[PDB]
């Protein structure tokens, strides 16, 4: 609810890569809250957006993106080339208990470290 | 690549809930591979589907669903009432290195256990 500085410890392919974040207000147009890394130039922002909906059903949406850049010869600032979009949506109903929601949550949280997905992401060979 | 029995250990709101899976072939229409729990009745299947695409960009899609049921008075078999859909899509480019993909992967994998998301899922109060 009352969000603060989320910092994740030691993630990314191995070992020693921490990740700090800061809140960046609430977008009142649709309720999306934003989290961002204190980068050097604000066009290079590791950003994580979360949201929730209201009724039908529910649309809990987490949309994470983190572009990278390169000092291309021809511009003053460094410039973005590629994106790294990722998004995940959760759909529930009015009558779902606490157990089902927690089950789906940590099931996805544990299944994202299974070797099936690390093959299917870092080398993209399917099943 | 060569997929086998994925079983996750001790997930869901607390403690003692394991989860076995089995492969269920490859759907040749679009390449989607399926994983499923050996349930009693095959209409109640904890299922996880994975896929990948080919070019533009990439569309690595993980679509997980697990209905629950109740013995409603009026039918022989138990019947499904609600769903618990969840899906997550990853979009990359041709020029993304290994580092960015692994970073986005385990960043989402660690961020799904942050207290922000457990509030926003199990009690749905936003930021």
């Amino acid at each position, epitope marked *: 609810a009352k969000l*603060e*500085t*989320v*910092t*994740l*410890g*030691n*993630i990314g392919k*191995d*070992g020693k890569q921490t990740l*700090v974040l*800061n809140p960046r207000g609430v977008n009142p147009t649709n309720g999306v809250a934003s989290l961002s890394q204190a980068g050097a130039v604000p066009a290079l922002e590791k950003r994580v957006t979360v949201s929730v909906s209201q009724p039908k059903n529910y649309k809990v949406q987490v949309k994470i993106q983190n572009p990278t850049a390169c000092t291309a010869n021809g511009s003053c600032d460094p410039s973005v080339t590629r994106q790294a979009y990722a998004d995940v949506t959760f759909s529930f109903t009015q009558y779902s208990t606490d157990e089902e929601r927690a089950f789906v949550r*940590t099931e996805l*949280a*544990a299944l994202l*470290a299974s070797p099936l997905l690390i093959d299917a992401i870092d080398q993209l060979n399917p099943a | 690549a060569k997929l086998e029995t994925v079983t*996750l*250990g*001790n*997930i869901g709101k*607390d*403690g*003692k809930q*394991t989860l076995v899976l089995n492969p269920r072939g490859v759907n040749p229409t679009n390449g989607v591979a399926s994983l499923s729990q050996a349930g009693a009745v095959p209409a109640l299947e904890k299922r996880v589907t994975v896929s990948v695409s080919q070019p533009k960009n990439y569309k690595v899609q993980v679509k997980i669903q697990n209905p629950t049921a109740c013995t409603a008075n009026g039918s022989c078999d138990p019947s499904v009432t609600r769903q618990a859909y969840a899906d997550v899509t990853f979009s990359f480019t041709q020029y993304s290195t290994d580092e960015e993909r692994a970073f986005v992967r*385990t960043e989402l*994998a*660690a961020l*799904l*256990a*942050s*207290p*922000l998301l457990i509030d926003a899922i199990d009690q749905l109060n936003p930021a």
Partner: antibody
Amino acid sequence: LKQSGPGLVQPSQSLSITCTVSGFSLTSYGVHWVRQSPGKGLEWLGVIWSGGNTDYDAAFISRLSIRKDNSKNQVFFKMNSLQADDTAIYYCARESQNYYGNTWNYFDY
Amino acid sequence: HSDIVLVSLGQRATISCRASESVDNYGISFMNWFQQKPGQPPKLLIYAASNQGSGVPARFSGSGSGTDFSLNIHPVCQQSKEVPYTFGGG
């Protein structure tokens, strides 16, 4: 948490300890190991977490193999050539990789 | 790197360390506190140097910035955490 391992071993051999966990899920946490002797208070946190196999204590690289599993939560480790003056009691711990402001989960043995 | 530290009305333990260990945006002071009973593993005291450990009574607290820490327990082991979490006793 649970704890089971053979004790009172003759010196200059290997020595292994297993541990399970029945609380959290081992994927998004970490396991810590300390010794406690009558000589010193308690010692290193050369440990592993997240599934990423990681660092050790600086003095004891020459020993201390470590493994992490997900079959059911086995975090069993071993020691090669147990020197005879390594007389202590070994303790395991949990750790959360989840800094959130300052309220942050930590050290339930 | 290492550090050194030492019926009513309370007393307190002091501290001395080299690095102030201020790695992040003010959730920084990773200094901790431990007391143990003999037949038990050591229960967790206040973590992050001022933040009222999980399941502790309210009479325990700590305060102070980096390399300057304190206790206050007036009605009635130390460790630091930068990279290898080495420390000593008291």
